[PDB]
């Protein structure tokens, strides 16, 4: 049916640094705050999926 | 890099916006780059774990 949505729930489809697995990073982050944090990715940051992080 | 155990693989314990549940955000960047993104979280930002992100 219909529902609301808002420019928050956004999706940086990235990869995991330790396992090169695809990660859907749903980060609930305003588009240019997402952009900003994606500049932090482009600087240094990677994500490490909670599966692989738990397995280590 | 070379060697291992580099000061990036870090953990912003936050909560899911909609599960209202503990997400240990395993995000891999230097402490103050982590911190900067944590200031985004302290401003406005949330995380939406791949479980709820998939299920909505
Ligand atoms: Zn991973
Ligand atoms: Zn959640």
UniProtKB/Swiss-Prot annotation, chains A, B:
UniProt-annotated location(s): Host cytoplasm; Host nucleus
Post-translational modification: Highly phosphorylated.
TM region positions: none
Signal peptide: none
Motif Nuclear export signal location, chain numbering: 34-42
Domain of life of the native organism: Viruses
ZnF (unnamed) intervals: 16-52
Complex and partners: Homodimer. Homooligomer. Interacts with host RB1; this interaction induces dissociation of RB1-E2F1 complex thereby disrupting RB1 activity. Interacts with host EP300; this interaction represses EP300 transcriptional activity. Interacts with protein E2; this interaction inhibits E7 oncogenic activity. Interacts with host TMEM173/STING; this interaction impairs the ability of TMEM173/STING to sense cytosolic DNA and promote the production of type I interferon (IFN-alpha and IFN-beta).
Record's comment describing the protein's domains: The E7 terminal domain is an intrinsically disordered domain, whose flexibility and conformational transitions confer target adaptability to the oncoprotein. It allows adaptation to a variety of protein targets and exposes the PEST degradation sequence that regulates its turnover in the cell.
Annotated family: Belongs to the papillomaviridae E7 protein family.
Annotated function: Plays a role in viral genome replication by driving entry of quiescent cells into the cell cycle. Stimulation of progression from G1 to S phase allows the virus to efficiently use the cellular DNA replicating machinery to achieve viral genome replication. E7 protein has both transforming and trans-activating activities. Induces the disassembly of the E2F1 transcription factor from RB1, with subsequent transcriptional activation of E2F1-regulated S-phase genes. Interferes with host histone deacetylation mediated by HDAC1 and HDAC2, leading to transcription activation.
Descriptive protein name: Protein E7
Record gene name: E7
């Amino acid at each position: 049916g219909s529902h609301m949505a808002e420019p928050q729930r956004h999706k940086i489809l990235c990869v995991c640094c330790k396992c090169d697995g695809r990660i859907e990073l749903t980060v609930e982050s305003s588009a240019e705050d997402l952009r900003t944090l994606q500049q932090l990715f482009l600087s240094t940051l990677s994500f490490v999926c909670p599966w692989c992080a738990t397995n280590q």
